Structure 1
Amino acid sequence: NVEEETKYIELMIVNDHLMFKKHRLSVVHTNTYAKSVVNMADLIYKDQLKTRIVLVAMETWATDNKFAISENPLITLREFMKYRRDFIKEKSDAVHLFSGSQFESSRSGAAYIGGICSLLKGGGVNEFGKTDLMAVTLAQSLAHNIGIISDKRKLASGECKCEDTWSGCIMGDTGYYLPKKFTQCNIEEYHDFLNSGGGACLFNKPSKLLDPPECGNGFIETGEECDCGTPAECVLEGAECCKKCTLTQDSQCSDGLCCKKCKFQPMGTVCREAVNDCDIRETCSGNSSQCAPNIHKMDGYSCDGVQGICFGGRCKTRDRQCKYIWGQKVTASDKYCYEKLNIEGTEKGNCGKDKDTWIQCNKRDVLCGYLLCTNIGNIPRLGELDGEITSTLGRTLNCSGGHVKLEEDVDLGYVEDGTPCGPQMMCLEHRCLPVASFNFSTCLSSKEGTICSGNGVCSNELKCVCNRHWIGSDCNTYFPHN
């Protein structure tokens, strides 16, 4: 399935001048050092995650640091990410900073949780360290970016623990003696993230790498007509397709799901079933060995008739917010709490985060104020509590809320932006606002007030993907075919 498919995370490394000076000002040494670290992290990820981290590019500042460098991991991470947004433009799934400034914190590297495949969130910062040390830090940070984090609630409950009890696991504080195995909850979080639609940009094979043309490296690069890998593992997959980076008499493929038994599969086959309603099934082009590019519902499309919205391919509901923030057993409360707590109250219902004078929420809409769920546990899966978890009690409901934080300034305790409040009514700056606030673009439509001429759904690339037997770009002409 989609999980079993080989993910390809396009990573680019940004390097500051501190470790450049520490490496005797040598460009080539830093380049090969980054290549070795990338290879080591890929070897880590290949055992379980089945994900190859392709070092698409790397930048090292031989001159000096462009922006302010501080020992605070959060401030330095923000500066690196804003520098990436301002200057870095090349397509890359993850943008990771090797921080020469060794952070004065207790955590090795600072990476956003579930932030991969994002312009302002796709990557993290890894501090200076030993080759293995920063390789482990990069592995932890990339696990963070793909939503793989140590589960605090399961740690307290003992639901899942590190099977490498010798020296702990990678997700925890980086001990000197590195382990070799990830926990099963790491992989479970990976399936949950991929099924949610996150990390959809990791399914592309780059054609250009920092590595010279190497036969059997697992990627069809420049100068290689086909690549089935080393013949040791080529027997299982693509045995007759490609041999020694060369075709076997009459052939059309090397690997890939869209090409079964080294031959082209029939047209219309689904090489990737949609994970949810936010995902769009991918069909092979009929002449491309690799599966179709990942396409999801455009940002603003609802998971259901009214409730829920797909952002970046990930569904968002109040119930989904409670599940991500608090836990699976925790579900969003009814409108009763929303209209009985957000209207007036301290620490119970608040629109904006103001400890002194809490922001009042109007009765027109109360679905963007304090996030209220049902049966909130002792501790959330991720984040921290700003004080104590708020608890509030003809129908009786167990009403609860909190102020779950994160490594970013954004507060997960409130309702995340874009959560629906009604018809085209979704959160923006802790308030229900229409689509005009977000200024969502209109896809290729021919009628009035429709999407892709009514029948058809626009993908994430703002391009229409018409339905069956609709070859027109704007879903206007019918072309029967067999």
Structure 2
Amino acid sequence: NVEEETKYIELMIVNDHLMFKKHRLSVVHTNTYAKSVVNMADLIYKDQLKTRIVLVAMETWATDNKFAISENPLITLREFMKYRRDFIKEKSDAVHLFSGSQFESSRSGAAYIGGICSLLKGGGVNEFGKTDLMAVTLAQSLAHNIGIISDKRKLASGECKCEDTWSGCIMGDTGYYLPKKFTQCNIEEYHDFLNSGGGACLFNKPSKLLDPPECGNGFIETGEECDCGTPAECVLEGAECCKKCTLTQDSQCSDGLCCKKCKFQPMGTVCREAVNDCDIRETCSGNSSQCAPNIHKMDGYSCDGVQGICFGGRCKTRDRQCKYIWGQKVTASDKYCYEKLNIEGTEKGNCGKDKDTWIQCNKRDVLCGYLLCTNIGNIPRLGELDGEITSTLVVQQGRTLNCSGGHVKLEEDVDLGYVEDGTPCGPQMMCLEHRCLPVASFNFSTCLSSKEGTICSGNGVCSNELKCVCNRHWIGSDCNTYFPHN
């Protein structure tokens, strides 16, 4: 499926000036030192998460810092992503900072939850340490980007516990020594993220790793035609056609989803099925051994049947937001809970807070204010609960409804407990800054179309790469030309 495939995190590392000074003003030392940290973090990911950490790019600030590095990991993280948005022009799944300085709290790093593949959120910041120690810091930073959050609700209950206390578990920063393993709960959180449609950019295999070619690492570099895993794992797949990184007589490929016996899989063979209704299925090219780079519908397509809208391959509904914060057993409150409590302007329903006084929602923006769920807990899966749980009770001519809420903080700016931006609030209307606005107020980019009022000439789907994925028998960058082939 999608959780059985090997994932690949194309990673870029940025070393600041203090990291450069930690290695005697030597560029070669810093870069090889950072490769070691990545290499060890790869070994942790390689087995447990069925995911590989591939270093694709790196830069070192030999002269000075481009921005003011902060003692607060979150402030540094935010300013670092600003730098990478405006200055970093190399392609990567995630960009991480290697800081020579030290942060205030025992938190050795900060990274955005479910951040990968994103331009503004795909990255983290990591403080200096030992090679073995920093690899753990990177392993938990990338885990956050990857969707592994370490469920607080299950932790407080005692549901999820570190079974192998082999110097503890990684997402258990509760104790600090040398955590080498993820909990089974961690693996599930990662699977759920991939099945949710997250991490689409984690499905392509790199070729030229920033290190000289070596036959037998499982990566097709310069000079070598094929490459199976290693002589041991090679026997399972590829040993029949690959020999000394060279193809045999009857072979087009060695290993991959689009490689049957030792030959290619016919063009149009389903190699990857859609994980959700935001996703697009992938077909074998008939030309490559790899299953084509994982792509999905562009941001704007409705999901869950008009109830949600796709963003980054993930569906945004109020019910899914309630489950993300409070647990799978929790459901979103009735639309009436919103329609009545949010116009009041109390702690029990509002459009935000001003000067210690709650803002009462307009009747138009009633689904974009305070997030209301049904039977809520008192310990969120992530973030910090800021205060007490809201719980009012409204009657509806025979149906007594339970509307509940809570203020869950991640950033000092970002607050979960209010309807997330992009969530549908009506036909062709979404939430933005606690306001129900038309789809135009988001100015989505579009694919090419040669028919008035259609997406991809009405014969295709607009991908997140802003390319037209045509239906059968239709060709062209706009899917406007009919070309059947049988």
Q: TM-score range by the shorter chain?
A: over 0.9
Matches within 5 A, 1:237-252: 237-252=237-252
Q: Is residue 440 of structure 2 the alignment partner of residue 436 of structure 1?
A: yes
Alpha-carbon contact 2:241-2:251 (below 8 Å) kept = yes
Provide Cα deviations, 1:115-147, integer angstroms capped at 9, x if missing partner. 111101101011011111110000010001111
Question: CA separation in 2, counterparts of 1:330 and 1:403?
Answer: 16
- Alpha-carbon deviation of 1:350? 1.9
Q: 178-187 vs 294-303, which deviates more?
A: 178-187
Task: Quote the offset at 1:480 in angstroms.
Answer: 2.2
2:29 is paired with a residue whose SS is helix
8 Å contact kept, 1:162–1:183: yes
Cα 1:408–1:252 shift into 2, 3 Å: farther
CA contact (8 A) 1:252 1:264 kept: yes
- Residue 402 of structure 1, CA deviation: 1.3
Which residue of 2 is the match for residue 226 of structure 1? 226
Hey, what does 1:425 align to over in structure 2? Answer: 429
The 2-side partners of 1:193 and 1:103 are apart by: 29
Q: Does structure 2 conserve the Cα–Cα contact (< 8 Å) formed by 1:17 and 1:65?
A: yes
Partners of 1:179 and 1:442 in 2: CA distance: 45
CA distance in 1, matches of 2:391, 2:218: 54
Deviations 1:34-66 (A, max 9, x none): 111111011000111111111001111111111
**Whole-angstrom distance in 2 between the partners of 1:471 and 1:25:** 55
Q: Partner of 1:50 in structure 2? A: 50
Distance 1:330 1:176, change over 3 A: closer
**DSSP 3-state at the match of 2:323:** helix
Task: Count residues in correspondence.
Answer: 482
C-alpha displacement at 1:167, in angstroms? 3.0
**How much has 1:181 moved relative to structure 2?**
2.4
Contact 1:164–1:180 (Cα < 8 Å) also in 2: no
Report the Cα offset of residue 468 of structure 1.
2.0
The one-character-per-residue Cα deviations of 1:158-187 (angstroms, maximum 9, x if unpaired) are 222111235321112275532332111111
**After superposition, what is the alpha-carbon deviation per residue over 1:54-100, rounded to whole angstroms, capped at 9, x for unaligned?**
10011111111111122111111111111111101211001011121
- Give how far 1:353 is off: 3.7
Greater shift, 352-361 or 33-42, is seen at 352-361
- The farther-off stretch of 446-455 and 282-291 is 446-455
Alignment of 1:287 with 2:287, yes or no, is yes
Deviation of 1:408 after TM superposition, in Å, equals: 6.0
Of 316-325 and 247-256, deviating more is: 247-256
| Runs of 5+ consecutive residues of structure 2 not aligned to the other structure | none
Question: Distance in 2 between the 1:454 and 1:305 partners?
Answer: 20
| Conservation of the 8 A alpha-carbon contact between 1:151 and 1:381 | yes
Deviation at 1:250, TM superposition (A): 2.9
C-alpha distance in 2, partners of 1:241/1:355?
70
Q: TM-score, normalised by structure 1?
A: 0.97
Query: How far is 1:212 from its partner?
Result: 0.7
Gaps of at least 5 residues in structure 1 are none
After alignment, is 117-126 or 461-470 more displaced?
Answer: 461-470
CA 1:175 to 1:369, structure 2 compared with 1: closer, same or farther past 3 Å? closer
Q: Which runs of 4+ in 1 moved over 3 A?
A: 174-177
| C-alpha contact 2:345 2:359 (8 A) present in aligned 1 | no
Q: Which residue of 2 aligns with 1:386?
A: 386
**TM-score, length-scaled by structure 2:** 0.96
Q: Distance in 2 between matches of 1:407 and 1:184?
A: 27
Q: Structure 2: how far apart are the matches of 1:57 and 1:364?
A: 47
The 2-side partners of 1:473 and 1:144 are apart by 36
Structure 1 Cα separation of the partners of residues 468 and 257 of structure 2: 24
Determine the C-alpha separation between the residues in 2 that align with 1:215 and 1:22: 33
Q: Which moved more, 1:55-64 or 1:245-254?
A: 245-254
User: Is residue 16–residue 60 contact of structure 2 (8 Å, CA) maintained in 1?
Assistant: yes
Mapped to 2, the partners of 1:130 and 1:239 lie a distance apart of 38
8 A Cα contact 2:228 2:254, kept in partner: yes
Q: Helix, strand or coil: the match of 2:404?
A: strand
Distance 2:2 2:411 in 1: 30
C-alpha change, 1:15 and 1:408, in structure 2 (3 Å) is farther
Deviates further, 160-169 or 62-71: 160-169
Contact 2:168/2:180 (8 A) holds in 1: no
- In the TM superposition, residue 228 of structure 1 has moved relative to its aligned partner by 1.2
> Aligned partners of 1:441, 1:449: CA distance in 2, in Å?
15
- 2:20 & 2:111 partners in 1: Cα distance? 22
Contact 2:136–2:180 (Cα < 8 Å) also in 1: no
Give the stretch that moved more between structures: 316-325 or 176-185: 176-185
- Residue deviations 1:347-370 (CA, integer Å, cap 9, x gap): 222223435232221112311011
Q: 1:123 to 1:305 in 2, by over 3 A?
A: same
Q: Which moved more, 1:218-227 or 1:187-196?
A: 218-227
Compared CA separation, residues 408 and 202, structure 1 to 2 (3 A)? farther
Displacement of 1:237: 1.4
Let me know the Cα RMSD of the aligned residues.
1.5
The answer as to whether partners of 1:164 and 1:179 remain within 8 angstroms in 2 is: no
